[PDB]
Amino acid sequence: GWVRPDLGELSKVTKVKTDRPLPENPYHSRARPEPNPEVEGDLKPARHGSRLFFWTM
Amino acid sequence: RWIARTFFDAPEKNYERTMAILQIESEKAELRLKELEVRRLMRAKGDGPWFQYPTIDKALIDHSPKATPDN
């Protein structure tokens, strides 16, 4: 028997079943250290202009 | 009395002008001192959103199964 595998039948990405389940964290790695608190919200108007030396407002 | 009536400005007006300018520039001075302290601690610690020099961005990083098994 054993009909010859035709072109292109040694291709064609394929499903396959196993016994053991898929792992978590295949790179043995710690968590992300510290997220950045994002500054959010609608802005109030500028408190007293530039707050430079002078020319207020 | 007539010169004080027709050409000058009242002492109450001057007094409330003094209290107003002191209130405004007190807000200015306290905001400025808080500004410099916030800036120096934000440089020293980096928790704030200002001194974040642009790091590596991972949006172009796409993982996929390669040709070599141990990547």
GROMACS .gro file of C-alpha atoms in nm, chain B:
model
   71
   58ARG     CA    1  -1.269  11.783   5.052
   59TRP     CA    2  -1.359  11.865   4.692
   60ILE     CA    3  -1.023  11.740   4.561
   61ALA     CA    4  -1.071  11.421   4.762
   62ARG     CA    5  -1.419  11.386   4.611
   63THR     CA    6  -1.360  11.453   4.241
   64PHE     CA    7  -0.999  11.351   4.167
   65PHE     CA    8  -0.894  11.082   4.414
   66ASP     CA    9  -0.975  10.723   4.510
   67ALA     CA   10  -1.127  10.597   4.833
   68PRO     CA   11  -0.921  10.433   5.110
   69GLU     CA   12  -1.162  10.137   5.121
   70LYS     CA   13  -1.096  10.076   4.752
   71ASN     CA   14  -0.719  10.087   4.815
   72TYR     CA   15  -0.749   9.853   5.114
   73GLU     CA   16  -0.951   9.590   4.931
   74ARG     CA   17  -0.713   9.621   4.636
   75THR     CA   18  -0.425   9.539   4.874
   76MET     CA   19  -0.610   9.238   5.014
   77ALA     CA   20  -0.693   9.116   4.662
   78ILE     CA   21  -0.335   9.146   4.532
   79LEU     CA   22  -0.200   8.968   4.841
   80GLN     CA   23  -0.449   8.682   4.796
   81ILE     CA   24  -0.366   8.642   4.424
   82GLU     CA   25   0.010   8.647   4.463
   83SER     CA   26  -0.009   8.422   4.770
   84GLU     CA   27  -0.173   8.166   4.539
   85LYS     CA   28   0.108   8.233   4.289
   86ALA     CA   29   0.387   8.177   4.543
   87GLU     CA   30   0.238   7.860   4.691
   88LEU     CA   31   0.172   7.712   4.346
   89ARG     CA   32   0.529   7.792   4.243
   90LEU     CA   33   0.684   7.627   4.549
   91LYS     CA   34   0.465   7.319   4.502
   92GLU     CA   35   0.568   7.322   4.133
   93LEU     CA   36   0.940   7.308   4.205
   94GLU     CA   37   0.900   7.041   4.475
   95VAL     CA   38   0.683   6.825   4.246
   96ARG     CA   39   0.937   6.865   3.965
   97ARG     CA   40   1.235   6.765   4.180
   98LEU     CA   41   1.069   6.461   4.337
   99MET     CA   42   0.931   6.355   3.999
  100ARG     CA   43   1.281   6.360   3.856
  101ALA     CA   44   1.414   6.174   4.160
  102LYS     CA   45   1.151   5.898   4.147
  103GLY     CA   46   1.000   5.899   3.798
  104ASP     CA   47   0.649   5.797   3.906
  105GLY     CA   48   0.493   6.100   3.739
  106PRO     CA   49   0.402   6.141   3.371
  107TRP     CA   50   0.666   6.405   3.287
  108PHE     CA   51   1.022   6.269   3.276
  109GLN     CA   52   0.940   5.954   3.082
  110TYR     CA   53   1.209   5.939   2.816
  111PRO     CA   54   1.084   5.715   2.533
  112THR     CA   55   1.163   5.350   2.602
  113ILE     CA   56   1.134   5.048   2.375
  114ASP     CA   57   0.786   5.012   2.227
  115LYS     CA   58   0.654   4.657   2.181
  116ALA     CA   59   0.379   4.725   1.924
  117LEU     CA   60   0.614   4.620   1.644
  118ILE     CA   61   0.709   4.305   1.840
  119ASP     CA   62   0.510   4.012   1.699
  120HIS     CA   63   0.576   3.662   1.830
  121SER     CA   64   0.535   3.362   1.600
  122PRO     CA   65   0.669   3.005   1.582
  123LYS     CA   66   1.003   3.040   1.404
  124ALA     CA   67   1.219   2.795   1.212
  125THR     CA   68   1.453   2.724   1.507
  126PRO     CA   69   1.278   2.548   1.801
  127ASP     CA   70   1.494   2.693   2.079
  128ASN     CA   71   1.458   3.059   1.987
   0.00000   0.00000   0.00000
